[PDB]
Design a binder for these strands. Structure first.
Ligand SMILES: *[C@@H]1O[C@H](CO)[C@@H](O[C@@H]2O[C@H](CO)[C@@H](O)[C@H](O)[C@H]2NC(C)=O)[C@H](O)[C@H]1NC(C)=O
Ligand SMILES: *[C@@H]1O[C@H](CO)[C@@H](O[C@@H]2O[C@H](CO)[C@@H](O)[C@H](O)[C@H]2NC(C)=O)[C@H](O)[C@H]1NC(C)=O
Ligand SMILES: *[C@@H]1O[C@H](CO)[C@@H](O)[C@H](O)[C@H]1NC(C)=O
Ligand SMILES: *[C@@H]1O[C@H](CO)[C@@H](O)[C@H](O)[C@H]1NC(C)=O
Ligand SMILES: *[C@@H]1O[C@H](CO)[C@@H](O)[C@H](O)[C@H]1NC(C)=O
Ligand SMILES: *[C@@H]1O[C@H](CO)[C@@H](O)[C@H](O)[C@H]1NC(C)=O
Ligand SMILES: *[C@@H]1O[C@H](CO)[C@@H](O)[C@H](O)[C@H]1NC(C)=O
Ligand SMILES: *[C@@H]1O[C@H](CO)[C@@H](O)[C@H](O)[C@H]1NC(C)=O
Ligand SMILES: *[C@@H]1O[C@H](CO)[C@@H](O)[C@H](O)[C@H]1NC(C)=O
Ligand SMILES: *[C@@H]1O[C@H](CO)[C@@H](O)[C@H](O)[C@H]1NC(C)=O
Ligand SMILES: *[C@@H]1O[C@H](CO)[C@@H](O)[C@H](O)[C@H]1NC(C)=O
Ligand SMILES: *[C@@H]1O[C@H](CO)[C@@H](O)[C@H](O)[C@H]1NC(C)=O
Ligand SMILES: *[C@@H]1O[C@H](CO)[C@@H](O)[C@H](O)[C@H]1NC(C)=O
Ligand SMILES: *[C@@H]1O[C@H](CO)[C@@H](O)[C@H](O)[C@H]1NC(C)=O
Ligand SMILES: *[C@@H]1O[C@H](CO)[C@@H](O)[C@H](O)[C@H]1NC(C)=O
Ligand code: NA
Lengths: 749, 747
DNA sequence: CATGACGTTCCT
DNA sequence: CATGACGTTCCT
């Protein structure tokens, strides 16, 4: 049975996904298709420039419709091609069940007629420059109206968006209104008092008064940021904001008793008026980033009594010309008893001392502290010892150099109690004194420093709780046998991208320390170019995962018998990545020397042109084998051996032309098979002994299928269509003639 | 007309190249083949296990025959498969013109009968474990005999190679003998006195006496290294050599009056007996590397008076356990008046001072000094000011951190004075380090840890510096006078300084480029430049800019800010825009590249469309590299008229068709790469049936449809321009022809 | 026959 | 029916 909505794909929850199919018109599906079951129709980024009364009328129960990016205005078109989208009068009225409509990134200049069922309407990046009471007539259920970006540098219009006074008052249920990037100079008058979210950023609203927020006492979030910009900080085209601005009335916000979030970023503020925050008893999030508040934060009383604030962003409040020698936060920060997160990155100050953050030092709920990108060159990390709630400190991208004068292979630190990021700093050695008061730390990131030390067990002595240590992207000289032995709780160690020492031709290195790390579970030695003069064996009874990608096992395993048991003493290993090791050849003997406990083996992006399948019996616990990106020319030379517990096999991006009958048939636990990006001209059920119904994933995309009438693959792919990703569109013909590059369904074979 | 020696390829100077064709037997070429043109036949790395009397018998002018790697011994086989090569009695006698034979990496246990014309014979990595007077009968013209590696860890045999006393004396013209890796314990007796090169390294010859070199007074090179090894330094399996060894006689070499080169590397030497080198009046090259000579070199008189010596290698004479605080070379080094090159890398000493190298400092001819990998942490670079001859110092891979308490980027090989300080521990650059190095023309500082905001103060003394390599550092580029203190600067490598450009929210500034009035070559490659940078690069001097590995994608999406970024490079002729994540181009932004451009690389982007007509905006463009993009056709108009384009690379795209006449108006086109696309045909119509001016047309790695097709006749017509035509141009279809050469069958 | 096309965007 | 095969090796 054909996919029911060709050329589109039926996805869960009644979604017909027609995205990125280069359609010039809305598909008309068969009277035989289950049109009644379609609840969402996605037409993202097709080339539909004309919508008709008939387009959606046969989808009797359509609730959600996405027409984004079909006819982009010239400014947003990659080639600046103009586009005007025409819409027949009843296009959307013909869908009286429609609840959500996305019409963004289309060249339309007026709002079409819309059914009164509508709950959510997105008209952003269109060319609609006016809203009046007739524009959205009858939409009494509308909760969300987003119309951002109809007049700005990427979509210019030569004037302001004009929203007539009271234009939206008929929208009695409207809770969310966003009108960003519309070249506004004033807040539209008499907006719906139902509003909870009003987003007016990146216009030119440079004066704000309580009258501009009349009757909006239901507001939970107000964003007026980016209206009076500091263009020194801009990454994009930026209009200068004259120095008399902004002009905020002291009582602008005082009636917004329900306000939870206020965004005043990128407003050229040199002053905080405490009166702005005084009526705001429910305020939990305040964004003051990208202002000129560097001196203000040393003295302000504006945080006095804001004992409910949870998140405060003061990032990029930097002085144009300078960094500060010292920075001392105002006493009023000590009032912020609910504060959980403080972002102070990008301010630029040279010293972090006890005085710097003293008012924060007893805040009981302060969990996250962002101090990155501050050009700090002296930091007393001991200041943090007694912060009672700290989970996470980001001190990355600083110039600290010492004491004061995927997850299957490497876990993240997100679930840990206390994490310090000192990555992208200027350490060349590690001295334990810098860590003396950080014994509570569970995770420490030191990646991308300049550490060139021969570590030896003396560096990390204070770090008695440390579980995870990231030393990636340094120059550690590994040879001392007691490296990292001073870390009693170390479970994960990342030594990836420490290749320089290993590249020193003729100088030996030593990985015997690995055996002396009794709790180590995850290790990376990836991208180190390890290739000669190293330990003959890695040993560990604890290790579960080893990333050895990006080395030269090719060289090592060509060196007589020296390295043939390199991984064998990893007696508990379950995951091993040998990708990108320049392997042109393996031995069965060498595969039988990997740990018997192995469950997952990656050999991606090597140069293997032959693989001895029968050797898989030497890894009885193997579940996943990844051979993607090698040079296999066939799946032959026997077939997958019996008794295999293999569940997942990836042979994508090889050069496979042929698979022998039965190749996969004895791998009774096989569930996921990737054959994508090979040279297969057919897909044969005989490869599976005609028992392919247990597969959950069978990816045959990017193969030169021969689209002749009655090829095996047609019927077969239909039989296992639930397993084949992208079947309707991404499974293409290589031949014959004009079918090359087309879907196998472009024609009925 | 078919290629004349299918399945092989005819190459220049009468070479028939049959390499890597998986052949199981020597080809018998067509009846009409021009066999008298075959002066060399290469059969490297096929799977020919049986050679026959008739194999080479019709090749009447054959001079050179390469059969290497056809039947490797088990130890050398990638899978340890055994192989024995059989050779019929007259296989080579049938070629009385044969001068050079390579039989290495084949499982043979005896030497075949060979023609008396033979000049060179390579029998290495075979299983021949004896040579007797009957092994090489009648080869009176033989000058070279290489038989290395017939008994060692990769090809074991369980005994020594046995060369009978006087076995080779009938080789009256023999000048080169190599018998390395053969498990020898003594030098074979009574070797030919004609010998000039005798190579005996990596055996177990641990005693050497003048009698072991009897009558070999024509020797120019003797290599006995690696016979008594230090296994601590070994990268491979290594047999420890008992401490009583080696045993050399004081006069072992004294009769070798013509000796030019002597190799005593990896011999476990703790002593140098000056008598070894006295009387070697012609000695120019001495290799003493990988011994234990670290104390010996501070005191030895062994170099006293060795006035002819030009090259001395003392590398990796390190102490097992330690580095030395100081190292002082012996006074005798001051007598090496001919010395041109001294290799002292890998000895391990912490300080380089005036005293360290004092004996070298007046040697008039000393040009190259190798001091890398020494763990040096203090270096007074001013010591070098007054060395009269110095061209090149390698101080890479050390721990120096400051003063003591090609068409895109030229190399420094032609300059007067180059210092390599790459892979050191600089975090800033202080001018004082360089105060006495004003003469330098090239300075390499790659792979240090330099994190400074350069500002025009760093390099003040370097008033002759032409080339400066700062790749692989963390330089913060924003000061407007960076590098302006270098008045001769012509080439600057700032590649791989990505960390600062990766600081999201923090701006950088490239305006200093405009202030470098002699700059010709600049690399900003692999910097991840993507936002908050100068809107324009400006230079009237620059010829070449490598901007590969950035994010012009992001920059050119940012309204109009960066649309003129390269336009002010008013003399630019080469630009690399590869790997910039480009999914699209504007025609107007290609027309904002300098009109002077000759070469534009756009490799490894994600371009699925290209507006060919935009090429008229670059009137001087000769080379366009679009390899590794996502083009699905060559269409959308042709190459425009008037183009000077000579070279076009569209390899590794997804091209499935080319419109008729696509290439026809590109009258200067000479080189076209279509490799690794999805083309099922090759059509002369693409060229308007005028493809004869092409010098290179690469159509390899395309799924050609091998039906009884345009391409067949066409490729034979332009065969001189098609690389690898006999073997690497393959069928995608139909049926069993998939993956075979288009010549595997007659289409 | 006042319209196509480009292309995984968009963010600031 | 005492043999094939693997592969761009080899270096120390
Ligand atoms: C099968 O393999 C292909 C290609 O090897 C996968 O496609 C890639 O997917 C990864 C992440 O999963 C991306 O990083 C690549 O950029 C994709 N490239 C292409 C060309 O598609 C594909 O996802 C795999 N299939 C499944 C079901 O996992
Ligand atoms: C045509 O293009 C192909 C592929 O893009 C070239 O093949 C590559 O050549 C370079 C060396 O120049 C190697 O680094 C790659 O590994 C090669 N890959 C393959 C698959 O061959 C080919 O050399 C080009 N042809 C000519 C005549 O220059
Ligand atoms: C809001 O919408 C609901 C339907 O979702 C409707 O029943 C209710 O009457 C509407 N209220 C107003 C004020 O329009
Ligand atoms: C914004 O409006 C002003 C004044 O009407 C106009 O000059 C300017 O062109 C407009 N900006 C844009 C991007 O269209
Ligand atoms: C605010 O609402 C009151 C009645 O609730 C009305 O009198 C007044 O006009 C409203 N203000 C605006 C600006 O719409
Ligand atoms: C929060 O807003 C409510 C209305 O939702 C108001 O009654 C209350 O006073 C506010 N809370 C505080 C602490 O002011
Ligand atoms: C480790 O090295 C440091 C300095 O490099 C040194 O002080 C300490 O003694 C060393 N520790 C050991 C165990 O050798
Ligand atoms: C590696 O270091 C260990 C010290 O734990 C030592 O026993 C061993 O000999 C060294 N091995 C190599 C190959 O350097
Ligand atoms: C593996 O199979 C291929 C054909 O699919 C064949 O050419 C080759 O000889 C086989 N190799 C082995 C070792 O059996
Ligand atoms: C050496 O070879 C030459 C030709 O290259 C030959 O004429 C001469 O007789 C040979 N000499 C000896 C001593 O065999
Ligand atoms: C070298 O010869 C010895 C003694 O005859 C023998 O024991 C050894 O196995 C040989 N070595 C090799 C690599 O065959
Ligand atoms: C060295 O040459 C002389 C004759 O020139 C000969 O008598 C003697 O046997 C030779 N020595 C050896 C070891 O062959
Ligand atoms: C450059 O920076 C150094 C410190 O690295 C400073 O001493 C010097 O004065 C600065 N030079 C200029 C020209 O600003
Ligand atoms: C770069 O510096 C120059 C002055 O040297 C200044 O004109 C320009 O604004 C700066 N550009 C950026 C992007 O910072
Ligand atoms: C480019 O050519 C392709 C045919 O290969 C065509 O589909 C596409 O519409 C053309 N684009 C333009 C801009 O002409
Ligand atoms: Na253990």
């Amino acid at each position: 049975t054909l996919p029911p909505f060709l050329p589109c794909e039926l996805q869960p929850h009644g979604l017909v996904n027609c995205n990125w199919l280069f359609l010039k018109s809305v598909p008309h599906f068969s009277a035989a298709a289950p049109r009644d079951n379609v609840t969402s129709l996605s037409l993202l980024s097709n080339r539909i420039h004309h919508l008709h009364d008939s387009d959606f009328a046969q989808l009797s129960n359509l609730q959600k419709l996405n027409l984004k990016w079909n006819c982009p205005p010239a400014g947003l078109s990659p080639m600046h091609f103009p586009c005007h989208m025409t819409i027949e009068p009843n296009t959307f009225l013909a869908v009286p069940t429609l609840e959500e409509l996305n019409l963004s990134y289309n060249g339309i200049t007026t709002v079409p007629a819309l059914p009164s069922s509508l709950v959510s309407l997105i008209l952003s990046r269109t060319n609609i420059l006016q809203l009046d009471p007739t524009s959205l007539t009858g939409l009494h259920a509308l909760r969300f109206l987003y119309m951002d970006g109809n007049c700005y540098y990427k979509n210019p219009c030569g004037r302001a968006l004009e929203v007539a006074p009271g234009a939206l008052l008929g929208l009695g249920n409207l809770t969310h209104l966003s009108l960003k990037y519309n070249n506004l100079t004033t807040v539209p008058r008499s907006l719906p008092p139902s509003l909870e979210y009003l987003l007016l950023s990146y216009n030119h609203i440079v004066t704000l008064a309580p009258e501009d927020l009349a009757n909006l006492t239901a507001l939970r979030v107000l964003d007026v940021g980016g209206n009076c910009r500091r263009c020194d900080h801009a990454r994009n085209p930026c209009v200068e904001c004259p120095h008399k601005f902004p002009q905020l009335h002291s009582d602008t916000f005082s009636h917004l008793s329900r306000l939870e979030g206020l965004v005043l970023k990128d407003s050229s503020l040199y002053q905080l008026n405490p009166r702005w925050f005084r009526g705001l008893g429910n305020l939990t999030v305040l964004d003051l980033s990208e202002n000129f508040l560097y001196d203000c934060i040393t003295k302000t009383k504006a945080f006095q009594g804001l004992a409910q604030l949870r998140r405060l962003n003061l990032s990029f409040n930097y002085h144009k010309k300078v960094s500060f020698a010292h920075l001392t936060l105002a006493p009023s920060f000590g009032s912020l008893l609910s504060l959980q997160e403080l972002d102070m990155h990008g301010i630029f100050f040279r010293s972090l001392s006890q005085k710097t953050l003293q008012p924060l030092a007893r805040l009981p709920m302060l969990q996250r502290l962002y101090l990155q990108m501050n050009f700090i060159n002296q930091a007393q990390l001991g200041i943090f010892k007694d912060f009672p709630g700290l989970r996470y400190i980001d001190l990355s991208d600083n110039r600290i150099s010492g004491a004061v004068e995927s997850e299957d292979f490497m876990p993240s630190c997100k679930n840990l109690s206390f994490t310090l990021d000192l990555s992208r700093n200027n350490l060349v050695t590690v001295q334990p004194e810098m860590f003396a008061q950080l014994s509570r730390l569970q995770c420490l990131r030191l990646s991308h420093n300049s550490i060139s030390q021969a570590v030896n067990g003396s560096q990390f002595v204070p770090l008695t709780s440390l579980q995870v240590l990231d030393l990636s992207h340094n120059k550690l000289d590994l040879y001392h046998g007691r490296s990292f032995t001073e870390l009693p709780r170390l479970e994960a160690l990342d030594l990836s991208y420490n290749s320089q020492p290993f590249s020193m031709r003729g100088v030996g290195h030593n990985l015997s320390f690995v055996a002396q790390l009794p709790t180590l579970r995850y290790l990376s030695l990836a991208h180190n170019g390890i290739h000669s003069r190293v330990s003959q064996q890695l040993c560990s009874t604890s290790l579960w995962a080893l990333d050895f990608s990006g080395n030269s096992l090719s060289q090592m395993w060509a060196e007589g018998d020296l390295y043939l048991r390199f991984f064998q003493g990893l007696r508990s290993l379950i995951r091993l990545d040998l990708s990108q090791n320049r392997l042109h050849t393996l031995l069965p003997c060498t595969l039988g020397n990997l740990p018997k406990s192995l469950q997952l083996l990656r050999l991606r992006n090597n140069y293997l042109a032959f693989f001895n399948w029968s050797s898989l019996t030497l890894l009885p616990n193997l579940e996943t084998l990844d051979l993607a990106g090698n040079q296999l020319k066939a799946l032959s030379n026997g077939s997958l051996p019996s008794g295999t517990q293999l569940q997942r096999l990836d042979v994508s991006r090889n050069s496979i032309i042929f698979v022998v009958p039965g190749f996969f048939a004895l791998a009774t636990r096989l569930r996921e098979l990737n054959l994508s990006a090979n040279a297969l001209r057919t897909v044969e059920p005989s490869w599976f002994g005609f028992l392919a119904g247990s597969l959950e994933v069978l990816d045959v995309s990017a193969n030169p299928l021969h689209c002749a009438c009655g090829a095996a693959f047609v019927d077969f792919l239909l039989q296992v269509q639930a397993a084949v990703p992208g079947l309707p569109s991404r499974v293409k013909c290589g031949s014959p003639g004009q079918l090359q590059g087309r879907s196998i369904f472009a024609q009925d074979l």
